[PDB]
Write a protein that binds this ligand. Structure first.
Ligand SMILES: *[C@@H]1O[C@H](CO)[C@@H](O)[C@H](O)C1NC(C)=O
Lengths: 15, 36, 253
């Protein structure tokens, strides 16, 4: 903690 | 697993294992009042 | 990482990416310490003040990465979590003392040129390397600036350990023995720090006696990023080694 677009993954990985 | 890691722990396949150094490791070494 | 550089390929093969299922997002850094165990900061998973409480099923682990947003086909390995363990005395109520957690993978991961575990320190290693002025190395995909942006590949920065008193004198938060601080002093004219996104990643050192890499710290907190007179704080792995040992010994390995 500081006190002040991802390529899709393959359908399996989830579950 | 349990401390001191694994038999092979902490030795990188692309550097230690082939005797290559990464671009900044020496900075570290030199800081320990001069590495191995 | 603020004021760091692009890592080289295979430079931190124990670097892990904690990844949010949905929305799909980068949650925090982490480290691979065996074929089935990952180490991170408790606060990456639990922080009631912000309503943060993740579960096994909520996350994914990505290992062997380099690129921040791409899915590295044939290079990266993705695993699912079997169980999460937070230290019983982790203190999120006040100072984040004991910010550490272990995650058991669903199935062991295989090692490769890009995936390899780091070692955990022994008392002697700790004693010999954890001294003010010695440098250690931080890695991660976190932000590049306090307000900026986000990097393309893994970033790296080398930082020196700081004398406890200076650490204490830089903040109002109360410091414990389970923590240490690191960064350059204002005079020093050399910068660098961890930032948002870096949390839970590894602070490592290389042993000059046996050539191995040891993880001495976990990125824990800071007040802003890279400010002058300020320092990053890290969980002191060795002082928590027993809890690690215990958990691994009792729930497999
Ligand atoms: C996180 O969420 C859990 C179950 O999935 C709990 O049982 C637990 O008490 C928790 N954290 C609390 C809110 O601090």
């Amino acid at each position: 903690x500081v006190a002040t677009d991802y390529e899709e993954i393959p359908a399996a990985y989830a579950x | 697993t349990f401390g001191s890691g694994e038999a092979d722990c902490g030795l990188r396949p692309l550097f230690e294992k082939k005797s290559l150094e990464d671009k900044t490791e020496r900075e570290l070494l030199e800081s320990y009042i001069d590495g191995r | 990482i603020v004021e760091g550089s692009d890592a080289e390929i295979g430079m931190s093969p124990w670097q892990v990416m904690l990844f949010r299922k949905s929305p799909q997002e980068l949650l925090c850094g982490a480290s691979l310490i065996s074929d089935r165990w990952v180490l991170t900061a408790a606060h990456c998973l639990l922080y009631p003040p912000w309503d943060k409480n993740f579960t096994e099923n909520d996350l994914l682990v990505r290992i062997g990465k380099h690129s921040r947003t791409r899915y590295e086909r044939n290079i990266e390995k993705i695993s699912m979590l079997e169980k999460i363990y937070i230290h019983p005395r982790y203190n999120w109520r006040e100072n984040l003392d004991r910010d550490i957690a272990l995650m058991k993978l669903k199935k062991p991961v295989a090692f490769s040129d890009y995936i390899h575990p780091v070692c955990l320190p022994d008392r002697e290693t700790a004693a010999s390397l954890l001294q003010a002025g010695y440098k250690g190395r931080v890695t991660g995909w976190g932000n590049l600036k306090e307000t900026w942006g986000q990097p393309s590949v893994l970033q790296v920065v080398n930082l020196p350990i700081v004398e406890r008193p200076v650490c204490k004198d830089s903040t109002r938060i109360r410091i414990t023995d389970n923590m240490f601080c690191a960064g350059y002093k204002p005079d020093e004219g050399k910068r660098g720090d961890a930032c948002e996104g870096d949390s839970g990643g590894p602070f490592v050192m290389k042993s000059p006696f046996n050539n191995r890499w040891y993880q001495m710290g976990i990125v824990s907190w800071g007040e802003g990023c890279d400010r002058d007179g300020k320092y990053g704080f890290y969980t002191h792995v060795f002082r928590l080694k027993k809890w690690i040992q215990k958990v691994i010994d009792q729930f497999g390995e």
